[PDB]
């Protein structure tokens, strides 16, 4: 279940977990994003609550994008213990995402 991350529940999902949080930065007008969307959702089903998956709409939340320097979408951030540990810019194959995730399990 890809949780919808907003400014209210942000800390609740990112600074209160011990598990790796993958965060997807999208927007409705972004075509490349539409490649990632179904994959993130599939991986949230492979990992049985082992990794948290979350979405941030950069339109609705332009300021949080700003804080972590999100220059362009799509972009995945990997959060571990509240702090960013990895960044993936641009759409990549399901297998290649699974290869970067395993490191942080």
């Amino acid at each position: 279940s890809v949780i919808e991350i907003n400014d209210e529940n942000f800390d609740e999902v990112i600074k209160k977990s011990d598990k790796v949080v993958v965060v997807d930065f999208w927007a409705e007008w972004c075509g490349p994003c539409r490649m990632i969307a179904p994959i993130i959702e599939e991986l949230a089903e492979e990992y049985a609550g082992k990794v948290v998956f979350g979405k941030v709409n950069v339109d609705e939340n332009p300021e949080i994008a700003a804080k972590y320097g999100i220059m362009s979408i799509p972009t995945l951030l990997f959060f571990k213990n509240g702090k960013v540990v990895d960044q993936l810019v641009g759409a990549r194959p399901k297998e290649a995402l699974k290869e970067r995730i395993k490191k942080y399990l």
Side-chain angles (χ1 to χ4, degrees), residues 5 9-11 13-14 17 21 23 79 81-82:
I5 288 154
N9 72 338
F10 181 91
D11 281 27
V13 314
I14 283 200
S17 187
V21 174
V23 172
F79 276 87
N81 285 310

Side-chain angles (χ1 to χ4, degrees), residues 66-70 72-84:
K67 192 174 49 155
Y68 300 106
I70 307 301
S72 79
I73 54 182
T75 284
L76 298 175
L77 291 193
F78 293 5
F79 276 87
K80 182 74 174 70
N81 285 310
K83 69 181 193 299
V84 171

